[PDB]
Design a protein around this ligand. Structure first.
Ligand SMILES: Nc1nc2c(ncn2[C@@H]2O[C@H](COP(=O)(O)OP(=O)(O)O)[C@@H](O)[C@H]2O)c(=O)[nH]1
Ligand SMILES: [Mg+2]
Length: 166
């Protein structure tokens, strides 16, 4: 039977949001940076499942809107550059800040430690520890190390998403 789900994709700028959307939509990786925009809604169909994906700007100027775009969705995907050690603390802070918002209560969160292909990229345990993901207790939370460039764990990411297609 047909399913329709909505996902919101947030995380700091340069974490890989737009790249990830394109890998999910087409299977193709882009090395180039598409310019950053406040929002972009795309519909991606995977067989019987239609995914309405909100790709949300991660620059400081867009972050106050993250909550509004996350409201009512099937799952929040939180993109992290697992290779950019300097930005992990800010990435962490924005995640926990976002999940303080009561209208987001209970919505499943998938944290993606992107750029696994790069030297020094954090794995699941390392990202879970550095981002204090164990502290997130009101909802289902999952973390995967992925590479949009080499495809590692794109399959399981999509599987996780479909399992939350409602
Ligand atoms: N090495 C590597 N680079 C990636 C990967 N995913 C995205 N990128 C690159 O990281 C940069 C930022 O990606 P982008 O999708 O524009 O990030 P966004 O600001 O979160 O939308 C781009 O140059 C992408 O090519 C990955 O898995 N590995
Ligand atoms: Mg982008």
């Amino acid at each position: 039977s047909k399913e329709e789900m909505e996902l919101t994709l947030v995380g700091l700028q340069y974490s890989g949001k737009t790249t990830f959307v394109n890998v999910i939509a087409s299977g193709q990786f882009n090395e180039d940076m598409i310019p950053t925009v406040g929002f972009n809604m795309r519909k991606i169909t995977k067989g019987n499942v239609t995914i309405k994906l909100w790709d949300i700007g991660g620059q400081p100027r867009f972050r106050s809107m993250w909550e509004r775009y996350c409201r009512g969705v099937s799952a929040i995907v939180y993109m992290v550059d697992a290779a950019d050690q300097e930005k992990i603390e800010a990435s962490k802070n924005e995640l926990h800040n976002l999940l303080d918002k009561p209208q987001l209560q209970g919505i499943p969160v998938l944290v993606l430690g992107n750029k696994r292909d790069l030297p020094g990229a954090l794995d699941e345990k390392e990202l879970i520890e550095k981002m204090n993901l164990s502290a997130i207790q009101d909802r289902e939370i999952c973390c995967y190390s992925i590479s949009c460039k080499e495809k590692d764990n794109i399959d399981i990411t999509l599987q996780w998403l479909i399992q939350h297609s409602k």
